[PDB]
Structure formats: C-alpha cells, structure tokens
C-alpha cells in the first residue's frame, strides 16, 4: 500500500528513535497515524521495501498495524497505527503503582497473541523486547518493529558482539551462532514477561554483555519477580530452556496463559 504524502497532515512530533524521527498526524483528515521518517543510510532501503510488502500483509488486533509507505521521495516514510501511550517500558514505569497483577497478565497475553500470529506466518520478530512494544489509548499492548533488524546496516546493532546488540534478550543459539528462529523469539518473550512483571526493570541491569553471555552459558536465568506467581514464572521460565527444541510454541505458551487466567479468576 503506497500512500500519497499529500494525504498526510503532520500535527505533532513524537520524538526520535533508532530508525528515525517519528511524528503524529492524520491521514486524509480523519485517521490517526504515526509517521516515521527513515534516516538515509540507516537501513537497506530496497531490501526493506520488498519486506515492507510482507509486513503490510501482517494483520492482527495485537500487532501495531503498518498502513503503508511513501517511497517516491527520500527519506521514505513508514505510516503506522498511532499508539497514544507510547513505549511499553514507559507505560510500565508510569503507572506501575496502579497496575493489578491481572493487568500484567493481560499484557503478556496481548504480546503472546501477536507473536502467535507472527509464528503462524513464519515471520520472526528478531528483536522482541519491551523497547518495541507500544500501548494504545485503551491500554492494549501491541508488538512493533517486527523484523526490522534484518535491514539495519549499523555494524554494532547487527553484530552479536556489538555494543548495540540486545544481548540480555538474546537466546544462547543467537549469541553463539546467530541462529534466529521462533525459539529465539520465545526466549525474548520470556524476558519480556520478566520486564512486564518487573515493571520495566532492565534485565541484568548491572551486567555487561559478556557477563550476561557467560551467565546464560552456565545455565543460569533471570529470577522470579516478586510480583510473579509460581504459575506465571513457570511459563516464562519455560521459554529459557537451553535446548531450543524444548521451548514451547507461542500457541502452547498462549494456552498456558489462558489457563492461568481461568485459574486466577
Ligand atoms: C518505544 C517503544 C519506542 C520509541 O522510541 N518512541 C519514540 C517515539 C514513539 N513512537 C514510535 O517510535 N512509534 C513507531 C514505531 C514503529 C513504527 O514503524 C513500525 C511498526 C511496525 C513494524 C515496523 C515499523 C512507526 C512508529 C510510535 C507509534 N506508532 N505510535 C506512537 N508513538 C510511537 C515512541
């Protein structure tokens, strides 16, 4: 879906991310959108444009919807669903004093549903983390930037030894061999659940990249958050099996989450 940039009205700046400065505006006068401006030189644009066609066809209620791109000028624009409440980590860190444990479980369910959709399309996120989940005006958490790191040039972000890499959300098979799969997303999902139930602490907030890799190499894990019940910790902990093939699928993870919701009501 190519959008005509003459149909965009820019209203407010939402700040600047890694891929680009992003603004809030309206599309054809009526529809809320976010508009990302993609910095020249930051992404393999021709490869991204081919992949943008696939992301355009990803559609799930718990996935931030990509509405289209503007590619007949430079910089290219990404037009997406507007998420009034911003980053999940900021959201957790804003009203953490207000959340009920029932609310934290629903957020986990939101992300799991999005990932189950992605898993059903054999589409890897590649960088699942709270830093790319957003929250709408109804408090719904949505997954964002899915599959965006494959097109990033910067050498440190892509490299697994870079100072940009998400070591602390990376599974062993990624850190050792750059072996991405659904099971690497599962690992990250477990870490994300830790972030949600930890009200947005950085995992291993005191550790370097190297020390974290050594920790995971020794088979050690993040601890149970005080706010996490026994059952919920078991689900998230299951995502961190040393053997990728022993980790659950998002469908199985989801059913487990629904089972605890039925159990905790
Ligand atoms: C916090 C999780 C991220 C962050 O750095 N923010 C500063 C600006 C603000 N924000 C956005 O960055 N986005 C957003 C993210 C991703 C896209 O493109 C997209 C979505 C899905 C797949 C690929 C690309 C566009 C814009 C915001 C959005 N949509 N709404 C509201 N605030 C956003 C948070």
Numbering used by the authors: 395 to 659
Quote the study on this structure:
Bruton’s tyrosine kinase (BTK), is a non-receptor tyrosine kinase that is one of the five TEC family kinases expressed primarily in hematopoietic cells. BTK propagates signaling from the B-cell receptor, including B cells at very early stages of differentiation, as well as the Fc receptor, Toll-like receptors and chemokine receptors. In addition to its causative role in XLA, BTK is an essential signaling molecule for proliferation of leukemia and lymphoma cells in B cell malignancies. To facilitate crystal packing, we expressed the kinase domain of murine BTK (residues 396–659) with a kinase-inactive mutation, K430R, and substituted six residues in the activation loop with the corresponding residues from ITK (hereafter referred to as BTK KD), which we have previously shown stabilizes the activation loop in solution and has been employed in prior crystallization efforts.
This is accompanied by extensive contacts between the side chain of Phe413 on the glycine rich loop and the activation loop that are not present in the acalabrutinib complex structure or any of the other inhibitor bound structures. To test the degree to which this unusual activation loop conformation might be related to tirabrutinib binding, we solved the structure of BTK KD/tirabrutinib complex structure via co-crystallization of BTK and tirabrutinib. The x-ray data was collected from the crystals in the PEG 8000 condition and the BTK KD/tirabrutinib complex structure was determined to 2.6Å. Tirabrutinib binding is identical in the two structures but the activation loop adopts very different conformations in the two structures. Thus, we interpret differences in the tirabrutinib complex we report here and that solved previously to suggest that the drug bound kinase domain undergoes dynamic fluctuations. Acalabrutinib and tirabrutinib both contain the butynamide ‘warhead’ instead of the acrylamide group found in ibrutinib, zanubrutinib and orelabrutinib.
